[PDB]
Design a binder for this molecule. Structure first.
Ligand SMILES: COc1ccc(OCc2ccc(COc3c(Cl)cccc3Cl)cc2)c(Cl)c1
Lengths: 58, 68, 272, 262, 59, 68, 262
């Protein structure tokens, strides 16, 4: 289901340092990483419904 | 001018009619001259997402190094 | 849904074959027919089991809900979809553990003036909107949610034949479970008792969503009430694992009991 | 003959000289998931001989006053060797079973035990709050539970027991026990047999599920004809339960699950 | 301080000595987890009641 | 796309039409693409109760001794 | 290329962009016991994906002063998921391994680590009593041990340590370390590679043995050229060890073994 429900819970994603980030001198010691998400070729959805991501007052 | 298509049977009844024959087909006839009056057939095709997922000039293999 | 076998004539016997004797400990039922224990005549059987097929047993529209709306928040109502709000259809479905079918919903709508001598209103139009689990639920009888750009809605005009729609097999499993011996959560060691606790025999908190019903007309100060009786009929039926039927009164959505625990009457052992 | 058998699974063998045949539930023998019915895409683990073997759960004692016993599967086997390990290390698990109930007496004893295998054996609770039985009580493990002769409502609001209250003649679920024969079963009538043997395929509305959240089968044993002996008001005969999982396959490996207890 | 700014997309790392603590944590609820619910994938999933299939995370 | 099945005539009229011809047949045509919209054909099959009545491993004859 | 690789075993994948090829010990890839070399007659268990996957043991830190580290197999993996479970539930066990040592730095760091896989890696003790090292000390598990720069005899007669005293240049066994190159190995020279990868077949004088009594392989890591950086007398880079058992098959199932500890 597309809602938070324990019956259809999916699991956990996490990241850890395997070794460590190493930089030489004269180099920034902190840097960013960006994450991306996409569906694989076996992905499908069903039962069209209305989204809660858009509303209209009055 | 009738169009006879077959349905994609989901739940099957304990009948052989649920697995074959005209019993798993549906019939359609257009009554209006303007195509706008027609219903949607819903026998719609798909395509390759490549134009969005990989709009790359020099085609690359996933097993092979992207940056070469 | 077919024929029954003919009775073949059977004469007297004096043999070492004894079909009358058996041993039910094995877990099997003795498949005897009259000719096994008495002399029979030949009877050409014409009776069939056409009406006791799984399909014919369920091929009836049963009431599952009576939704009420008072057109003077009651200007609209929401009904959580279920078959357990009533007892008749529920008991029939529970002869089996799993099922798979399509559904036909027919809506009988009635309305009336609360006052015998007051008020008046023009013919009412109703909107029955299906809110799939996840979609925004209406807060007012006229907020943005009633635009139904994606949710399926049915607009019924009072006085017209009962509305009717069909729904496919919508389960997320390969069959509907009439019984679920489990929980939606597993409490883990270490977590607070408030944690990992869930209802016994419950799957999703919102299995099939709900119906939001309202009268579309602008409400008049007149006192009016409407009731939408929902009838559902399983069509294209398949069922698995038979179970004994409910003997005592239902006590909630579960198999819980409390009240009519002594269903059988008294009868003398040697009284016909 | 119908009466002598030998069952061998892994490193365990069971022999009987007084059987009454064996029942294969719904005529289906346990099997693995076929590719056409597969759901999780990851490679399954199939312990085979390490998990598919006979495990003997605790022995219960039958007395003139016993009302009955019940167990839940895979629950009763959760602490059994490598079967339990695989159950807790994987998100999903599937298995069939060979249930062998043992009970011998003598030619001067009487009594009959009804052994039923019930798919989705939901039991009734003890409070006015619906579906209130808590996880810890619903899953007793190898010790299982017992049937009662009557319903007794838990009234302690401060500390509700949140337990089951399975009344025997109501089959612990609001149905008459005499109709429980529609479920795969055997009867251990002391004058006829020693045991009951049932082969259970995996039954569920899914091909694979969570073994920790869901119990597929329930085993119910009820005294159909009470235990009686010579003239000894005092009589006790043990009932041992030996079960072997079959065609075990698990999917979704991660860190081990440690459920909350008591 | 980062939500609803360009910083909500940046997860910072550093050259500190090895630690066994997580850099980030997420729940696989593509349509409901706040971090996934507003991605193109999450936006589409919110117009449907059921989802099934595999996903891939690229860093 | 019409499906023509025959009816099982119960009460017979004093006509030959009650015993033969298209007069004892009924016609069906599906109008909807989704099989869910279809009515029930009701030409449903039966099966062997053995899976419930005799879920025994070693098959036994009623004439022969059950306990052998 | 010789430098980029991906290893997939079960549900675990390892990628590297700075490899120096991989070594397959003695040119033998791990395999299962053939019928012509079989000994125990019982049906083996082969956990497959549940046991044959990458397990990451604890990370150690390399400093200018480090002398070296060592581990024993299967010992270091005894507490690793379902591999450890199968190891303890069975009398006999056999497995090969894929050892992947990880160590990244920068272009301004120096140092070289010699990674050796030694069959029957017997180490020297600390007392005048021969073969006095006790079981608990010989089997440290995932944390392994360390090499020393010199031999120091344990003199506490009242409470002997009964531990190893592996001197580095003596390869912890009375042989010169420079000759340890006759054993399958790789070198992690910081200016060239990130890791070392070794595929180890099962080596023993028997087809299968007791995994609790006997360690087949030993992994020794020695700083051949000490760690040095820019001008930081202070430098620490972690060394992570990831090992995956291969072709696991166990024989002789019984109750679980619980060895004495510390
Ligand atoms: C085992 O027995 C079962 C299983 C499922 C059931 O309900 C499933 C269900 C799911 C969606 C809808 C939504 O149907 C509707 C729509 Cl799209 C539009 C308008 C009105 C309705 Cl009404 C209705 C029922 C019931 Cl009632 C009994």
């Amino acid at each position: 289901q597309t809602i938070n429900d324990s019956f259809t819970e999916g699991g956990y994603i996490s990241m850890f340092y395997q070794t460590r980030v190493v930089v030489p001198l004269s180099t920034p010691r902190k840097m960013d990483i960006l994450g991306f998400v996409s569906a694989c070729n076996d992905f499908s959805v069903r039962l069209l419904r209305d989204t809660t991501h858009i509303s209209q007052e009055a | 001018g009738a169009q006879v298509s077959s349905q994609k049977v989901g739940a099957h009844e304990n009948s052989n009619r649920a697995y074959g024959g005209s019993t798993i087909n549906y019939t359609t006839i257009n009554y209006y001259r303007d195509s706008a009056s027609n219903a949607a057939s819903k026998q719609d095709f798909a395509q390759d997402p490549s134009k969005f997922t990989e709009p790359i000039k020099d085609v690359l293999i996933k097993t092979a190094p992207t940056l070469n | 849904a077919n024929n029954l076998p003919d009775t073949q004539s059977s004469g007297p016997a004096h043999s070492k074959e004894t079909p009358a004797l058996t041993a039910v400990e094995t877990g099997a039922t003795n498949p005897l027919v009259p000719s096994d224990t008495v002399q029979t005549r030949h009877v050409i059987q014409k009776r069939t089991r056409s009406e006791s097929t799984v399909e014919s047993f369920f091929a009836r529209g049963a009431c599952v809900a009576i939704i009420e709306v008072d057109n003077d928040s009651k200007l609209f109502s929401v009904w959580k979809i279920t078959y357990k709000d009533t007892v008749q259809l529920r008991r029939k479905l529970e002869f089996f553990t799993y099922s798979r079918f399509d559904m036909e919903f027919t809506f009988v709508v009635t309305s009336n003036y609360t006052d015998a001598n007051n008020g008046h209103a023009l013919n009412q139009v109703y909107q029955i909107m299906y809110i799939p689990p996840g979609a925004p639920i209406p807060g007012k009888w006229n907020d943005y949610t009633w635009q139904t750009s994606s949710n399926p809605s049915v607009f019924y005009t009072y006085g017209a034949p009962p509305a009717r729609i069909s729904v496919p097999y919508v389960g997320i499993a390969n069959a509907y479970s009439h019984f679920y011996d489990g929980f939606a959560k597993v409490p883990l060691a270490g977590q607070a008792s408030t944690e990992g606790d869930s209802l016994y025999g419950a799957a999703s908190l919102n299995d099939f969503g709900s119906l939001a019903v309202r009268v579309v007309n602008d409400h008049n100060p007149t006192k009016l009430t409407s009731k939408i009786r929902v009838y559902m009929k399983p069509k294209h039926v398949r069922v698995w694992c038979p179970r004994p039927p409910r003997a005592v009164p239902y006590y909630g959505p579960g198999v819980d009991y409390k009240d009519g625990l002594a269903p059988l009457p008294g009868k003398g052992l040697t009284t016909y | 003959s119908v009466r002598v058998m030998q069952l061998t699974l892994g490193n365990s063998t069971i022999t009987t000289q007084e059987a009454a045949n064996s029942v294969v539930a719904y005529g289906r023998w346990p099997e693995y998931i076929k590719d056409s019915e597969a759901n999780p895409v990851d490679q399954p683990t199939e312990p085979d001989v390490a998990a598919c073997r006979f495990y003997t759960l605790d022995t219960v004692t039958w007395r003139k006053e016993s009302r009955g016993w019940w167990w839940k599967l895979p629950d009763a086997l959760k602490d059994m060797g490598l079967f339990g390990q695989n159950m807790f290390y994987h998100y999903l698990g599937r298995a069939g079973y060979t249930v062998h109930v043992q009970c011998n007496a003598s030619k001067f004893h009487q009594g009959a035990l009804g052994v039923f295998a019930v798919p989705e054996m939901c039991l009734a609770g003890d409070s006015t709050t619906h579906m209130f039985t808590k996880y810890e009580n619903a899953n007793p493990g190898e010790k299982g539970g017992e049937f009662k002769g009557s319903f007794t409502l838990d009234t302690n609001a401060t500390n509700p027991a949140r337990n089951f209250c399975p009344v025997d003649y109501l089959f612990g679920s609001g149905v008459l026990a005499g109709n429980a024969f529609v479920y795969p079963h055997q009867i251990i009538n002391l004058r006829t047999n020693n045991c009951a043997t049932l082969v259970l395929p995996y039954v569920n509305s899914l091909s694979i599920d969570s073994m920790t959240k869901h119990n597929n089968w329930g085993i119910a044993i009820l005294p159909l004809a009470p235990l009686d002996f010579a003239t000894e008001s005092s009589t006790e005969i043990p009932i041992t339960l030996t079960i072997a999982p079959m065609c075990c396959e698990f999917n979704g490996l991660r860190n081990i699950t440690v459920p909350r207890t008591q | 301080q980062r939500k609803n700014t360009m910083d909500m997309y940046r997860v910072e790392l550093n050259d500190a000595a090895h630690s066994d603590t997580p850099i980030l944590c997420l729940s696989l609820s593509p349509a409901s987890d706040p971090r996934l619910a507003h991605t193109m994938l999450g936006e589409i999933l919110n117009y449907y009641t059921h989802w099934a299939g595999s996903l891939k995370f690229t860093f």
